[PDB]
Design an enzyme around this catalytic site. Structure first.
Site, PDB file in Angstrom:
ATOM      1  N   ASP A  95       0.838  -1.219   0.000  1.00  0.00           N
ATOM      2  CA  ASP A  95       0.000   0.000   0.000  1.00  0.00           C
ATOM      3  C   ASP A  95       0.865   1.257   0.000  1.00  0.00           C
ATOM      4  O   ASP A  95       0.590   2.219  -0.716  1.00  0.00           O
ATOM      5  CB  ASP A  95      -0.926   0.032   1.226  1.00  0.00           C
ATOM      6  CG  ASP A  95      -2.087  -0.947   1.124  1.00  0.00           C
ATOM      7  OD1 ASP A  95      -2.197  -1.674   0.116  1.00  0.00           O
ATOM      8  OD2 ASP A  95      -2.901  -0.991   2.068  1.00  0.00           O
TER       9      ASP A  95
HETATM   10  N1  LIG Z   1       1.175   2.024  10.434  1.00  0.00           N
HETATM   11  C1  LIG Z   1      -0.008   2.260  10.995  1.00  0.00           C
HETATM   12  O1  LIG Z   1      -0.076   2.995  12.095  1.00  0.00           O
HETATM   13  C2  LIG Z   1      -1.237   1.718  10.405  1.00  0.00           C
HETATM   14  C3  LIG Z   1      -2.502   1.740  11.230  1.00  0.00           C
HETATM   15  C4  LIG Z   1      -3.495   0.735  10.662  1.00  0.00           C
HETATM   16  C5  LIG Z   1      -3.662   0.915   9.158  1.00  0.00           C
HETATM   17  N2  LIG Z   1      -2.337   0.950   8.531  1.00  0.00           N
HETATM   18  C6  LIG Z   1      -2.367   0.628   7.096  1.00  0.00           C
HETATM   19  O2  LIG Z   1      -1.606  -0.547   6.794  1.00  0.00           O
HETATM   20  C7  LIG Z   1      -0.994  -0.417   5.510  1.00  0.00           C
HETATM   21  C8  LIG Z   1       0.493  -0.670   5.702  1.00  0.00           C
HETATM   22  O3  LIG Z   1       1.212  -0.605   4.475  1.00  0.00           O
HETATM   23  P1  LIG Z   1       2.395  -1.652   4.163  1.00  0.00           P
HETATM   24  O4  LIG Z   1       2.841  -1.406   2.743  1.00  0.00           O
HETATM   25  O5  LIG Z   1       3.438  -1.553   5.247  1.00  0.00           O
HETATM   26  O6  LIG Z   1       1.657  -3.102   4.287  1.00  0.00           O
HETATM   27  P2  LIG Z   1       0.379  -3.585   3.409  1.00  0.00           P
HETATM   28  O7  LIG Z   1       0.331  -2.773   2.152  1.00  0.00           O
HETATM   29  O8  LIG Z   1      -0.880  -3.685   4.224  1.00  0.00           O
HETATM   30  O9  LIG Z   1       0.720  -5.098   2.999  1.00  0.00           O
HETATM   31  C9  LIG Z   1       2.035  -5.633   3.083  1.00  0.00           C
HETATM   32  C10 LIG Z   1       2.131  -7.004   2.415  1.00  0.00           C
HETATM   33  O10 LIG Z   1       2.983  -7.866   3.173  1.00  0.00           O
HETATM   34  C11 LIG Z   1       2.690  -9.210   2.780  1.00  0.00           C
HETATM   35  N3  LIG Z   1       3.074 -10.180   3.848  1.00  0.00           N
HETATM   36  C12 LIG Z   1       2.379 -10.565   4.935  1.00  0.00           C
HETATM   37  N4  LIG Z   1       3.113 -11.464   5.628  1.00  0.00           N
HETATM   38  C13 LIG Z   1       4.278 -11.638   4.973  1.00  0.00           C
HETATM   39  C14 LIG Z   1       5.398 -12.425   5.209  1.00  0.00           C
HETATM   40  N5  LIG Z   1       5.436 -13.223   6.303  1.00  0.00           N
HETATM   41  N6  LIG Z   1       6.436 -12.379   4.339  1.00  0.00           N
HETATM   42  C15 LIG Z   1       6.383 -11.577   3.256  1.00  0.00           C
HETATM   43  N7  LIG Z   1       5.310 -10.810   3.011  1.00  0.00           N
HETATM   44  C16 LIG Z   1       4.245 -10.828   3.855  1.00  0.00           C
HETATM   45  C17 LIG Z   1       1.210  -9.246   2.377  1.00  0.00           C
HETATM   46  O11 LIG Z   1       1.012  -9.946   1.139  1.00  0.00           O
HETATM   47  P3  LIG Z   1       1.081 -11.558   0.982  1.00  0.00           P
HETATM   48  O12 LIG Z   1       0.156 -12.066   2.054  1.00  0.00           O
HETATM   49  O13 LIG Z   1       2.541 -11.909   1.137  1.00  0.00           O
HETATM   50  O14 LIG Z   1       0.555 -11.818  -0.414  1.00  0.00           O
HETATM   51  C18 LIG Z   1       0.821  -7.777   2.267  1.00  0.00           C
HETATM   52  O15 LIG Z   1       0.184  -7.468   1.018  1.00  0.00           O
HETATM   53  C19 LIG Z   1      -1.343   0.973   4.990  1.00  0.00           C
HETATM   54  O16 LIG Z   1      -2.420   0.883   4.047  1.00  0.00           O
HETATM   55  C20 LIG Z   1      -1.783   1.743   6.218  1.00  0.00           C
HETATM   56  O17 LIG Z   1      -2.743   2.760   5.918  1.00  0.00           O
HETATM   57  C21 LIG Z   1      -1.260   1.253   9.139  1.00  0.00           C
END
Ligand SMILES: NC(=O)C1C=CCN([C@@H]2O[C@H](COP(=O)(O)OP(=O)(O)OC[C@H]3O[C@@H](n4cnc5c(N)ncnc54)[C@H](OP(=O)(O)O)[C@@H]3O)[C@@H](O)[C@H]2O)C1
Ligand SMILES: NC(=O)c1ccc[n+]([C@@H]2O[C@H](COP(=O)([O-])OP(=O)(O)OC[C@H]3O[C@@H](n4cnc5c(N)ncnc54)[C@H](O)[C@@H]3O)[C@@H](O)[C@H]2O)c1
Ligand SMILES: NC(=O)c1ccc[n+]([C@@H]2O[C@H](COP(=O)([O-])OP(=O)(O)OC[C@H]3O[C@@H](n4cnc5c(N)ncnc54)[C@H](O)[C@@H]3O)[C@@H](O)[C@H]2O)c1
Lengths: 173, 364, 378
Positions: A103
């Site tokens: 995101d």
């Molecule tokens: N920081 C705060 O104070 C917040 C308060 C709550 C809301 N918040 C929201 O959260 C997201 C965090 O963004 P980010 O890019 O860090 O993460 P994301 O874009 O959500 O997604 C990250 C990806 O990490 C992956 N993910 C999840 N687990 C893993 C592991 N273990 N290894 C590698 N990647 C992983 C997962 O995809 P996948 O499930 O792999 O297909 C996800 O799509 C953002 O939209 C914020 O508005 C933040």
């Protein structure tokens, strides 16, 4: 429709390569991939590559999520930068190593007005020469939307666990 | 325009709704920035710091607010029913932006409506990606979670980390975090980085992964039925816990009881409970607002206004939330503020406007 | 043979010279352990845990010490002059081991001498690597260093760690630790644990590597003169007025940007060296905190006052007394084990008696009086 790469193929892309920006997110925290990430950073740095960390204001799931885990893993503060400080540097970086972020990098935030992510500032990872995503599957982030960066020529998708992949990326170096 | 920021007059409030950084930005938008003398003292922001950033220092709260088109403050203004009629100092037709507590405090909304003040309640900010930078609930809860651990460590008579010494080893502190929202997550991070073993629990399912993403362990191995059923695997860990931190709120209603008096009897002496939900009735019935009470050998800490215990970091972040909300509506040319009514951030947060109550929940 | 441990009657002293683990080892050595009822309440050690460990409970302080062949205290016993006479409670001819404070406190010594009581002053432990296990200065000052940072964090109106947030970046707190001994090293670790940027300084040369191993950045001043700073025993000496100005100048660049100043500097037989003058605190940022751990030995900051927080020039100068007692539940088991490791090498196998080896340098340096004769060269 995605250029799906592996640990071996993703590794030497970053080896040379003059400048690397690490973009960590929630998946880095979920996997606890941060000791293995700083390991990789030290393998890049000792060879002579410029390493920096780009931290989005809402990376992870809490304020300062990436900061505490990077502090635990002993990455120093002088290499870690906020969005407004580091956004210009992606133009000069060869690779954007996106480890568990999504995101945070999504350009629909400034392109598509219909999206829930619209108007949130983002890290301009697309301006780097190549974009390495580490991410287990094609599922969405928190916002539930597709990232158009996943399936465009300059991007490479590394389907795996962030700690496992990063450890596997450290092998080939 | 003519934006004014007074001192906070409510007891124990050390925050202020300004910083020098935000003053510089406000004059760049075309504002004369006025602030009451002594307003930032609790936040370690001197009058000279504000003057150097471009602000004018007014001698009294009345002078500060007399000509002000916009008013920024942190807590809601006091009414004549509370002894200090602060809304009377606000200019007629002006804009107020603050933490109003509007849905629980209709009298201030009525009082502001009498003077045709347009009030923007910052707590009612819509939960969209765009308005995360405008979100006072998150910025202030985050620091309150950090504080909870600092308060717990201060009240506790053992050290947080494990220490292997020549004269023997002392074990780490065991921490249990009830409720893993913004506050709870920062409390998990702060406890864990100090060397404590950290457990946590929450009703919501996605929290388990969030707890684990900070190196904590989530309590679950294998109407009022939450309270009765939950405390069994929780009780096992609670008996071993040194610092219990409770952060759970239900929006509008009183706080859920997560530790009963019965549960504190089964805790070891020298333990401490930090009840961050004390202002909404507490997650522990034994907690009392503004007091540290000792019963069954356990300190139950119930400080009020925990963000104001971090006033010097809390105030810059609050002022930024106000600036990020304000900045999109300044027409750069012709020195005006035009709050766009199509905007969800404007419509979701506006409580009264031009002498009439606007918010659906507050209308007659 | 019988051992006894009373409750600490002195104002604010929440520690105790016992733990359940140490009781069991004393029973193994052949001691009947009579702890006073509720002696470990301030240290969160119950009577049940002492009982299950093998101790007996006594109702009063007088009943616990009545037939006790050996007595362990934390602080020195209160005389009749001080308020209430604990020195008279102890059986005549018994042996007494505690932080007696022998050099500063001469009235307590002669009172113990007059009752034939053999006193062992634990602060006078020779500084030898094998005696680290039995050294009360190190165990207690280590916890005082941790606690200084907790005290600092509690008095500070900002957060320690860096956090990038949607509302903006909260920067890390900057900590400066003056004097990197046992307390100062733990102050570095604990401050770094909380995410602070940590500076530090000392007169000794070998501590620069120790600061850098903990991730702090050292402030060098007079590298030439730092080689002639440490003594044979390992403690600092008085450096003089010229070095004081050299140091004060070097540290000023970082002290004006410092949020928490922890000062730990001590010199044996001397007042504590002044490291932050009133001119220096006027230069500091408002909301800043000074933790003066040397406040009971004069203070490294003249503005610090024993048992009080002083607010002056926008700065809090904190000067709590008995900082290890603010961590009493960790401090006490370690203080008890310091005494056990001192005593254990002198208990016989199956004689059921205690013969303190007079040949041993550990024993001779500790002893104050014995059978009504002050042996210590004071
Ligand atoms: N920081 C705060 O104070 C917040 C308060 C709550 C809301 N918040 C929201 O959260 C997201 C965090 O963004 P980010 O890019 O860090 O993460 P994301 O874009 O959500 O997604 C990250 C990806 O990490 C992956 N993910 C999840 N687990 C893993 C592991 N273990 N290894 C590698 N990647 C992983 C997962 O995809 P996948 O499930 O792999 O297909 C996800 O799509 C953002 O939209 C914020 O508005 C933040
Ligand atoms: N995160 C964001 O924050 C918002 C709310 O979270 P917040 O931290 O800001 O404030 P909050 O006070 O609502 O957080 C309290 C936390 O405690 C939990 N909780 C409520 N009742 C409980 C109970 N009976 N037992 C155990 N846990 C209980 C909730 O699930 C929540 O995560 C969400 O809308 C989301 O956008
Ligand atoms: N059993 C043993 O062998 C034993 C016992 C205790 C200490 N030690 C050693 O002795 C050393 C000192 O430990 P300590 O904690 O007892 O020291 P301390 O309590 O006497 O003083 C703390 C520190 O203050 C410093 N200091 C004094 N004056 C100063 C000034 N003018 N400016 C800046 N710093 C100043 C000292 O160098 C010292 O490091 C350590 O290296 C420790 O390992 C050894």
């Amino acid at each position: 429709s995605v250029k799906a790469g592996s640990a071996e193929d993703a590794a030497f892309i970053m080896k040379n390569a003059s400048k690397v920006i690490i973009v960590p997110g929630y998946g880095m925290a979920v996997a606890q991939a941060q000791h293995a990430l700083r390991e990789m950073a030290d393998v890049l740095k000792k060879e002579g590559v410029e390493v920096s960390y780009a931290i989005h204001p809402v990376a992870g799931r809490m304020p300062g999520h990436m900061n505490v885990l990077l502090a635990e893993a002993n990455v120093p503060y002088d290499e870690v930068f906020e969005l407004e400080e580091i956004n210009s540097s992606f133009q000069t970086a060869d690779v954007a190593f996106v480890i568990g972020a999504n995101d945070v990098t999504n350009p629909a935030a400034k392109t598509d007005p219909s999206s829930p992510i619209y108007g949130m500032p983002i890290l301009d990872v697309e301006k780097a020469g190549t974009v390495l995503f580490i991410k287990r599957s094609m599922a969405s982030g928190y916002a539930g939307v597709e990232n158009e960066l996943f399936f465009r020529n300059n991007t490479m998708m590394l389907f795996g666990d962030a700690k496992k992949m990063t450890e596997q990326i450290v092998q080939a170096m | 325009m003519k934006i004014a920021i007074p001192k906070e007059r409510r007891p124990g409030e050390d925050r202020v709704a300004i910083s020098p950084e935000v003053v510089k930005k406000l004059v760049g938008l075309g504002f004369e920035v006025i602030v009451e003398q002594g307003a930032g003292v609790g936040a370690s922001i001197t009058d000279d710091a504000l003057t150097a950033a471009g602000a004018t220092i007014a001698s009294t709260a009345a002078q500060a607010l007399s000509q002000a088109d916009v008013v920024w403050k942190v807590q809601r203004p006091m009414t004549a029913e509370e002894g200090t009629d602060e809304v009377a100092l606000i200019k007629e037709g002006a804009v107020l932006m603050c933490h109003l507590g509007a849905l629980t405090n209709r009298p201030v909304v009525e009082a502001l409506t009498k003077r045709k003040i347009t009030a923007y309640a910052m707590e009612l900010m819509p939960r969209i990606s765009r308005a995360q930078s405008m979100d006072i609930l998150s910025s202030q809860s985050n620091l309150a979670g950090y504080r909870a651990v600092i308060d717990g460590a201060y009240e506790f008579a053992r050290a947080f980390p494990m220490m292997m010494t020549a004269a023997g080893t002392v074990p780490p502190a065991r921490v249990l975090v009830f409720g893993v929202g913004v506050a709870g997550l920062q409390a998990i991070a702060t406890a864990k980085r100090l060397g404590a073993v950290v457990m946590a629990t929450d009703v919501r399912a996605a929290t388990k992964e969030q707890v684990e993403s900070l190196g904590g362990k989530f309590i679950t191995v294998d109407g009022e039925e939450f309270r009765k059923k939950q405390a069994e695997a929780v009780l096992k860990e609670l008996v071993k816990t040194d610092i219990a931190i409770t952060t759970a709120l239900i929006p509008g209603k009183p706080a859920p009881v997560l530790i009963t008096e019965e549960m504190v009897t089964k805790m070891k002496p020298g333990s401490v409970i930090i009840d961050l939900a004390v202002e909404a009735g507490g997650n522990c019935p034994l907690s009392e607002p503004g007091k540290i009470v000792v019963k069954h050998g356990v300190k139950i800490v119930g400080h009020t206004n925990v963000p104001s215990r971090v006033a010097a970091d809390a105030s810059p972040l609050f002022a930024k939330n106000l600036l990020n909300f304000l900045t999109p509506h300044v027409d750069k040319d012709t020195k005006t503020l035009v709050m766009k009514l199509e905007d969800e951030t404007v419509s979701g947060t506006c409580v009264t406007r031009d002498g009439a109550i606007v918010h659906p929940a507050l209308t007659g």
